[model samples]
Target: MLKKKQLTVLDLHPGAGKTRRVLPEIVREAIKKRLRTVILAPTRVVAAEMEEALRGLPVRYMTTAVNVTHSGTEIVDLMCHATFTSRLLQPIRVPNYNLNIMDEAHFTDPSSIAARGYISTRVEMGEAAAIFMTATPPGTRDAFPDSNSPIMDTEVEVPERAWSSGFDWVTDHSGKTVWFVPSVRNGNEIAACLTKAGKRVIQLSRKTFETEFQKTKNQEWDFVITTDISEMGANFKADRVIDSRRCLKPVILDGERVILAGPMPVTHASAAQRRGRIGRNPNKPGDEYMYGGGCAETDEGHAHWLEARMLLDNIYLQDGLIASLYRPEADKVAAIEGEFKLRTEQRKTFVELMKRGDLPVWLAYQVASAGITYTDRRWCFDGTTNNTIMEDSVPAEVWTKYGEKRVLKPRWMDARVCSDHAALKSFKEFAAGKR
Candidate 1:
């Protein structure tokens, strides 16, 4: 890495002493060479830990507490994924950091804003030398080149008690707990009950995690009830965990709020990260409880949700439409054949889009003009469900259409033909270049 390559991928295993041994030395070596550095971590917890680990080094970390600014002193800039996402908007804030280290690289999915910005820094802006670090990389890897994780072919199942609401079982559980709750209200009520029962408890949600996380960072708590917001790359030092089956994360689709459900598959990399949270100590064996067995439904639902958001992001950035930007191109239909294959509920997504102006109509026009013939079924509000929620049975014919070109810009490239919503705040400031 001293002089050979501009980009490298590190497949550091979970217990590989990556943070403890490898990263610090590499970073130290980097600053010694006078190369400006930026380290992107997934969460504030991990960012804080990294900052503390490299305390003596010339580094300044950006957590929720600090605004991003250069002191013209430190050679390093440590920040979380959210910070990077925001910084992406103000391209001027992007300093010429010669070396970029993406910790927990898998967390920055290809379709995400952070991934797009990271690529722009290296590929577009001519920044050099980047290392992507991760323990578990996804099959459809986003950033770095192809690599495999160390095989641990252990599919062994363990005993887990079912988790339900009301904290009726909280009295029986002991030691520091990290409960992956599905609801803010339910989690709050449970925390109050646990507090009344003399157990120190705090609840955190993704919406307020940036500010709310201060509680656990400074105090020793008995239980931490939280959403999946801070799930990735956080070490809570818990003795036990509860995966409440109902994960109600609100995601924007068609510019509307729809809840993404489930606590992720019980055996996936994300779920595994949660389990890894407790097993940090060798002396004490950690316990993980689940509400139900992992299933395909949760997996598919979450994937579609992410795909839908990415679709809109591409559109926004491409045409100053409160969508996608940068990468002169989007990630090509985002594997529409496999992951973007329309499901039953996704038909309702079209229904939702149609309700909000001519996006669906315009979207259909674009597809029809592109020679990708889609079965035009009239999807409506009332007829969708039992006179209710189940929207339409729209075909996945749009499946054949390409992602970036198809969704981003119309076939005609005529702004007069475009009739979509207003741009988001970020998009308005840093609007995508006009066609």
Candidate 2:
């Protein structure tokens, strides 16, 4: 369906049948032209859904889920963008697929290994026709511009329409409502309370997302209490959503949590995307959204620790910090030096102060990270804004450890995830070279 595909971004409305219609046509055309095709979705579940959607077509296919290649001249390689870096990542001995399609392109984080390294390599292979689709595109700002705005520090304020009256609002709603909560436990707890109120409720936690999702499609309920798992695969065509902007993420590797969890907030971009879930079916109307505040609180010292660690983690072209930084680049390195808006000699002075213990690098970077993001994105502080919180730098005395109590401005984040103390512990682990 797409002939010209020089980084084409179809920013069509969500649930507008772009995937259902455009995708089937895409496969058909590719098959007709005998074009080698590749479709990269953001996650394995998404990839699987896409495969199921295009089943029974006269097309030979393979997937990262099953195997890398399907041994055919004309083949459709369906996989998640993650395959580019995961263990499944390996040089494609087969000929390059000429038609490359990126689904959920908005998930692109230009700094991480996926964005900077793997996905970049795959997408920038100088392909013949590249088609990118996303229902949500990021808010556009100057990648590097001189302005009064500390763009990064500014928050995307989602409207707060208080649903404080109670479950009467939910119970009275005609069809179903996608109520977002913080964690698996939180979802279950909320559903328990909601059910006691005589509401037909289901907490679609991560463990039962698949089973619950299929049911949500075939049935109707008063309330569907859920986590972000329902955000992407929104089978529940509800007319409302309740985002509490609160969550607790577990710290684990492989499979189990080490009894550590972190507080998190739903992101602004997500705030917008999740709201779009409602009123989707043109068959329905009266879509309502609520940015419900909850009993969630942020930790100052840990929040600072989180800021420092996040900045360090994203700065590396890929992977963890300390070990990754000691393992280091140029070009983009110079790009950052320029963006810092400080003279080389002045930067050195800051470095020396941290080295000699007069100031902590972690403390200062907390501010710097606010001014920087991704590869070519940042808040851009030119020292002209009246909001000069710290004159673009901070003091040594303000530096803190995790447990120490310190006054700080509250930070609201759009990238919803849970955070825990293990962040500090992991940094300490790295500092002591346990890796």
Candidate 3:
């Protein structure tokens, strides 16, 4: 795969200290080949953790951002940085890196422009060597059959404790309580419930959470209610970790809102991470309790009980509730790669041609996929309106071929001219280019 410059995916269970285990291997191989390396994490916190992990290796490293530049000798072998995908639409350069590793790559939508942009940038720079590390990859239902990449998945098991609806167990427990809630509102609600139950609780507000978090960084609390967003790398060895009812939440998908349903489908990656917080210190025993209605063996909520059991027993195989959202982005990467290979031109030429007002915004997206610059223009309804929406370019062709309807802005395609003959012919000829 490396010889073919194909992307490799490494799927490992979270909380196994995966980053710590892999950093040494990556550094040894990079140093042996004398290749510069870029290790990308999904967020600033994760990037900081990775930066710390790299210190255990022999390589010298620095953390940087898009606007930030680092100037040092070749001896500085590794760059640990956050890929803020929201602002990473534009490609950036790495001074000495020919190898790229995207940690927690599953966080990226496979069909997003940011995903394609990163891939195309690597191709354009002749540095297609890349590795993707995540706890979850799109499975059979969520990934294209032909879009298979080499994957190495590590499965780890951690036991789970029985569920309890009341807070009496927590009050009687010998250690701290770590509660994972789906949202800030939920966190507050849970904290309030515990406090009203005559239990001491510390509900960290998001704004001042950091300061409080630092003070109690390693200390256990009677009750610490945290939203899922801030619980990724947090460490609290609790006698029991409780997950509030329903971990799934609504998310935007291709411009529509959707929710996960059926079998209480859970994101195995996240659940594993949550469970890892307990039973983490091998010296001591820890337990985890998922929400299950008070039923010992059988009931309607028994499905949830069974689901929790399956998740704990075989988390690596637990299907994601958002695979539909992930698959499309992954498929887009392949289609864009194909189009990019066919069109090689400077962004200046593409933008100049687009300004001619002869092609649809859809095709302009193809140009963007090829590493050409294409900024979004607004489309308004009323003749006298001046409002415009700045949105990412779309893969119209993919959607259309998949039996989905799309509204193309004919105004951008020279509606003044009766037929698409001239523009269409010009586009075909230019794309063919010196063939």
Total clashing pairs for each candidate: 8, 7, 3
Determine which window of 10 residues in candidate 1 has minimal summed lDDT.
426-435
Candidate models: Cα lDDT each = 0.48, 0.46, 0.41
Give the Cα error of residue 305 in candidate 1, in Å: 7.8
For residue 287, model 2's alpha carbon misses the true position, in angstroms, by 2.5
lDDT of 1 by residue, 1-435 (tens): 644235566766454666767789989899889887888877666777676667677777666644345566987888775455445432235675678777876562322433534444353334467776766544322211221222211222322233345435556766677876655656777677668768888777644675667888688898888766555666666656665534442232342223344334432545554444555555554344333334222333333334434333322133222333223223422333122223333433433333322232234333333343233222211122222211134211111112221112122222212111122111111112211
List TM-score per model, in order: 0.58, 0.54, 0.52
User: How would you order the candidates by lDDT, starting with the best?
Assistant: 1, 2, 3
Instruction: Write down the lDDT that model 3 would get.
Output: 0.41
Candidate 2 Cα errors over 4 Å, as ranges: 1-5, 43-45, 60-73, 87-95, 108-117, 121-128, 140-167, 205-208, 218-220, 246-265, 293-435
* Candidate 2 pairs with clashing backbones: 249-418, 261-420, 262-419, 262-420, 267-414, 267-415, 268-414
Which wins on lDDT, candidate 1 or candidate 2?
Answer: 1
TM-score ranking, high to low: 1, 2, 3
User: Which 10 successive residues of model 2 have the least lDDT summed?
Assistant: 323-332
lDDT per residue as tens, model 3, 1-435? 232255676765544555877755766677677666656655445555666666545544444422233444443343322232222222343343466666665442222224333543454445567666655543312111110122212222211222235434555666676766655445666667667666667665434455556544555458777654444455564656665423432222231112222223334444444444555555564254444311111122222222112112211111321111122233322122222222334433343433443333233433444454433222211112111111244321111322444333222222212122333334333332311
lDDT of 1 at 237: 64
Q: Is candidate 2 or candidate 3 better by TM-score?
A: 2
Residue 80 local lDDT, model 2: 54
